[PDB]
């Protein structure tokens, strides 16, 4: 059950300077990069072309190449239209793609944010504002909805091209997506009140279980941290436990994960 995300970030600093940068994710693996400095979209995995032929990919890349130049000029012109209401610097973010389900089911989305706030989406056959959006956006929405050629292209991208492409992606990248890499654990301590820390690192995929333990008894003062990434697309996590100094004897950190195949990791203090 995987989500395909195209994440676009655009900065317009003043009327004559801007950049647009994109990265694309399938679940938590990066499949594409598109730096402002590059004419073309970059594959970050061998399978990032999916099951599209070289000619189909060219046509798709070309549509995006036209989009990027056009988006840039359109924002610049919409700014002029609303002036002096709204002004540079401006940050625009797009989150788009499709969430794949079993059978031939999917939901596609195109969400737009302006200065960090979600304000606009494509829905059905048109651009619309969402709850909490300021009223001045109704004029930009009205203008973008005037463009019938863009509406038909976007609808096709959302309804057809995304799910088709993502189905092909999943086939071509099955083995990279289903890989198992093993966690490695280690222990440490910081500041009579100690904090004990169980470090776990190098595990893929993301789901994992980490608890502090006395033999067969889960110490439910354990505070699990956030999942932090490593460069090689594996994960890092730490679970902390508070204790009285001297009382650290007999505590262990137990780590369960799908790559271990039953044989859990236990490290005793």
């Amino acid at each position, epitope marked *: 059950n995987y989500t395909f995300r195209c994440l676009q970030m655009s900065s317009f600093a003043n009327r004559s300077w801007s950049r647009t940068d994109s990265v694309v994710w399938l679940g938590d693996l990066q499949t594409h990069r598109w730096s402002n400095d590059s004419a073309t979209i970059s594959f970050t995995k061998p399978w990032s072309q999916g099951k599209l032929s070289n000619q189909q990919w060219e046509k798709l890349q070309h549509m995006f190449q036209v989009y990027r130049v056009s988006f840039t000029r*359109d924002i610049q012109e919409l700014v002029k239209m609303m002036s002096p209401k709204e002004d540079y610097p401006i940050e625009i973010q797009l989150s788009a793609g499709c969430e794949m389900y079993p059978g031939n089911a999917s939901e596609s989305f195109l969400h737009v944010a302006f200065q960090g706030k979600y304000v606009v989406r494509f829905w059905g056959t048109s651009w619309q504002t969402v709850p909490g959006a300021p009223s001045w956006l109704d004029l930009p929405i009205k203008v973008l909805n005037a463009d019938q050629g863009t509406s038909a292209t976007v609808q096709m991208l959302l309804n057809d091209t995304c799910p088709l492409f993502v189905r092909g992606l999943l086939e071509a990248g099955k083995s990279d997506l289903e890989k198992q890499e093993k966690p490695v654990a280690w222990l440490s301590s910081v500041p009579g009140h100690r904090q004990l820390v169980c470090h776990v690192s190098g595990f893929y995929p993301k789901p994992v279980w980490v608890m502090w333990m006395r033999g067969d008894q889960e110490q439910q003062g354990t505070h699990r941290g956030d999942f932090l990434p490593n460069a090689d697309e594996t994960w890092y996590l730490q679970a902390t436990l508070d204790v009285e100094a001297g009382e650290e004897a007999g505590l262990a950190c137990r780590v369960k994960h799908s790559s271990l195949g039953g044989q859990d990791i236990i490290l005793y203090w």
Partner: T-cell receptor
Amino acid sequence: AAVTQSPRNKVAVTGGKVTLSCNQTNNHNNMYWYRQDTGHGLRLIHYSYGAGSTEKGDIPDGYKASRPSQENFSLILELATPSQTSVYFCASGDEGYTQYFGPGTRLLVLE
Amino acid sequence: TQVEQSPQSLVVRQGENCVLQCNYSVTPDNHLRWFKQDTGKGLVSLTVLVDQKDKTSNGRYSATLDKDAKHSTLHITATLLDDTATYICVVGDRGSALGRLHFGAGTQLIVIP
């Protein structure tokens, strides 16, 4: 959807102030001024997205624009030159791509 | 320039047909319009072509557009004296008022009565 220009024809002198005006009663937010010269297609001078806004076109130099109301968009030549001898067309439109043109204004600028 | 029109001018006898060419490099290409301009007068719209491969008609004027070739032709059947005019090709790069129009310099037609 009709657009009027005034004056329809004008003779002016170098250094003189010429004001070309455009009126439009359709409640269109957007207006546009072009000049036409032999051997070129129409070229955009200035445009406007609403009252109080003016924007530079492709060839803005020697021209100031002015949008005092929704109805009127004026092209001002503060210090007119012979190179501004041309036919000037104004246009308006709403949020769609169609631009509706006025009938044109001929300007001759003599020494 | 981004919009080239051919021929630059032509002389035809009343009742003959003629073909007018427009080639462009404009990107993107949302729509293409043909104007007629009588000497000293205004821009009268003849037809607007919007599709990938498009055809239109309007009495004696008919036209075509191929977006892949970036090419349009205007055909005038059975020319009349009043077709003496300049014919102008315009390409619009958006389907909204965010667009710019890219004007061709025009083909001059003279019909001999």
